[PDB]
Design an enzyme around this catalytic site. Structure first.
Site, PDB file in Angstrom:
ATOM      1  N   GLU A   1      11.901  -3.574  12.764  1.00 51.07           N
ATOM      2  CA  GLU A   1      13.103  -3.326  11.987  1.00 51.07           C
ATOM      3  C   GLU A   1      14.451  -3.328  12.361  1.00 51.07           C
ATOM      4  O   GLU A   1      15.396  -3.893  12.053  1.00 51.07           O
ATOM      5  CB  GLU A   1      13.026  -1.467  11.374  1.00 51.07           C
TER       6      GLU A   1
ATOM      7  N   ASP B   1       0.741  -1.092  -0.149  1.00 53.65           N
ATOM      8  CA  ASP B   1       0.001   0.009  -0.050  1.00 53.65           C
ATOM      9  C   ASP B   1       0.814   1.535  -0.159  1.00 53.65           C
ATOM     10  O   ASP B   1       0.272   2.165  -0.271  1.00 53.65           O
ATOM     11  CB  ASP B   1      -0.911  -0.230   1.115  1.00 53.65           C
TER      12      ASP B   1
END
Ligand SMILES: CC(=O)N[C@@H]1[C@@H](O)[C@H](O[C@@H]2O[C@H](CO)[C@H](O)[C@H](O)[C@H]2O)[C@@H](CO)O[C@@H]1O
Ligand SMILES: CC(=O)N[C@@H]1[C@@H](O)[C@H](O[C@@H]2O[C@H](CO)[C@H](O)[C@H](O)[C@H]2O)[C@@H](CO)O[C@H]1O
Ligand SMILES: O=c1ccn([C@@H]2O[C@H](COP(=O)(O)OP(=O)(O)O)[C@@H](O)[C@H]2O)c(=O)[nH]1
Ligand SMILES: O=c1ccn([C@@H]2O[C@H](COP(=O)(O)OP(=O)(O)O)[C@@H](O)[C@H]2O)c(=O)[nH]1
Ligand SMILES: [Mn+2]
Ligand SMILES: [Mn+2]
Lengths: 243, 245
Positions: free
Chosen positions: A193, A106
């Site tokens: 991350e 997206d």
């Protein structure tokens, strides 16, 4: 000689999926030497995704892995499957240059973004718009061109305060650190991350892109849920017509 | 190869650059495409001007501000679409036999490349299914065995003149030039009747040209973008306002 960019894209079945994959493919079709690793969050490859990838002519690999009952972040098991596939496909000391980028379906990506990450030697980073409750997050770079911190508001103490769409890794590091995967078990929100990068590189070795992290080349856009109230409980449109 | 004049109203807001960027990435694949970007602002903004110039696309950057007063029932981008219609009529002579098609494409929808080739051959007005409109998975024109549109498969007012969304039709340029008085209505039409207000002055149901495999395929999606959360910016701001996003 042009390094191959392996784009890892987790995806799942929902109304706007085809639209998302369509505009993303329209972007990727402009990028040379691009390998699209699409991993569906499903018990098996869906014909919708299979036909779309087939019809684009893009170089792709279509994989699948379903997320456990508890549904940890989003797309984790899918990105991990892609990492394992890469390690099973390319030998540790392979000579074929590659770069790995985790691109959600997206987000919005500029073409310049890919040109910037292609020369990644170890790990590259850049600003990302619409993340951490800000207009954008950006790594802090000194006059020498080194990353010394992060300009964020959300938990600025994470080892790597940056969104998934804000970095790319040279394939060599991924193959060498064969056991490095995104953490899904005991994982603090917003540390996915860091869970991976911490095992792959150190802050001082990061390669700042986007003019020393002063320009925004990628946006963390979100797509609104379509209103299907008029379909009713029995449905109005043809369920066999793909959207 | 007929030129496709894509009319896109746009306005300044956080996700604007992103919307124009991914839309440009799609449009860059389409040959003989003229992008008519109409900004809802008092003057051309540097952001949009720079982006259009950097894309390498054939474009015309216009602008007209929708009175602040009006935004306080007037459909979004109405004045911008009408400005583009007027520009086309003031730029192209009513008679010149110049092959062209006009398509009103909002900056947040998702378009497939196949869509443009379907509309490029439009002789009068072409129509096709559109996903995520009228509270449905998609709305689709209804065609008979003779190949003519005889109605519309929708739940919201399926009996209106043209029960179709802005993104579901395209108009032959020549027709736009001939019907020089045809513009989108500003006030007087019920909610959801603006597309009909224009089409009724351009063509009849019998002259519609069904596309997308006789209206059985979805080639365009009425996607919408969520508002970004900027709560951490605070009152005084955190990030640099000079940095373009
Ligand atoms: C749930 C529901 O029925 N919603 C409808 C809207 O769809 C409708 O908006 C119009 O919908 C048509 C569909 O062909 C076009 O997209 C048009 O541009 C829209 O304005 C409104 C109309 O007022 O009514 C409900 O909200
Ligand atoms: C308003 C706010 O602070 N929201 C935060 C989220 O930003 C945060 O999500 C993480 O944000 C980082 C930003 O670099 C990155 O996008 C991570 O992928 C994402 O998980 C969330 C953490 O659970 O907390 C919210 O409060
Ligand atoms: O059950 C799910 C929810 C998301 N995703 C994918 O994983 C990424 C996570 O994105 P999404 O939640 O938008 O992320 P957000 O915008 O919340 O960070 C996207 O590629 C999604 O398509 C998935 O595979 N399965
Ligand atoms: O003040 C405004 C609000 C919207 N628009 C534009 O007009 C179209 C209307 O779309 P938006 O409201 O998304 O439409 P919706 O999805 O509500 O139909 C889009 O191209 C917008 O960029 C505009 O020019 N000015
Ligand atoms: Mn997302
Ligand atoms: Mn819209």
């Amino acid at each position: 000689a042009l390094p191959t960019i392996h784009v890892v894209t987790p995806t799942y079945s929902r109304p706007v999926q085809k639209a998302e994959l369509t505009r993303m493919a329209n972007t990727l079709l402009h990028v040379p030497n691009l390998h699209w690793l699409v991993v569906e969050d499903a018990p098996r490859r869906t014909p919708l995704t299979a036909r779309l990838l087939r019809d684009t002519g893009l170089n792709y690999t279509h994989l699948h892995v379903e997320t456990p009952r508890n549904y940890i972040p989003r797309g984790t098991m899918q990105r991990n499957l892609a990492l394992r596939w890469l390690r099973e496909t390319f030998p540790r000391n392979s000579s074929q240059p590659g770069v790995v980028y985790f691109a959600d379906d997206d987000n919005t990506y500029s073409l310049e973004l890919f040109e910037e990450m292609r020369s990644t030697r170890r790990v590259s980073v850049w600003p990302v718009a619409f993340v951490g409750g800000l207009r954008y997050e950006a790594p802090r770079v000194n006059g020498a061109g080194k990353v010394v911190r992060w300009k964020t508001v959300f938990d600025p103490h994470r080892p790597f305060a940056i969104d998934m769409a804000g970095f790319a890794v040279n394939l060599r590091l991924i193959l060498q650190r064969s056991q490095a995967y995104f953490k899904l078990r005991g994982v603090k929100g917003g540390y996915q991350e860091s869970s991976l990068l911490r095992e792959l590189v150190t802050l001082n070795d990061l390669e700042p892109k986007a003019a020393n992290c002063t320009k925004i080349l990628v946006w963390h856009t979100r797509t609104e849920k379509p209103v299907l109230v008029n379909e009713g409980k029995k449905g109005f449109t043809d369920p066999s017509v793909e959207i």
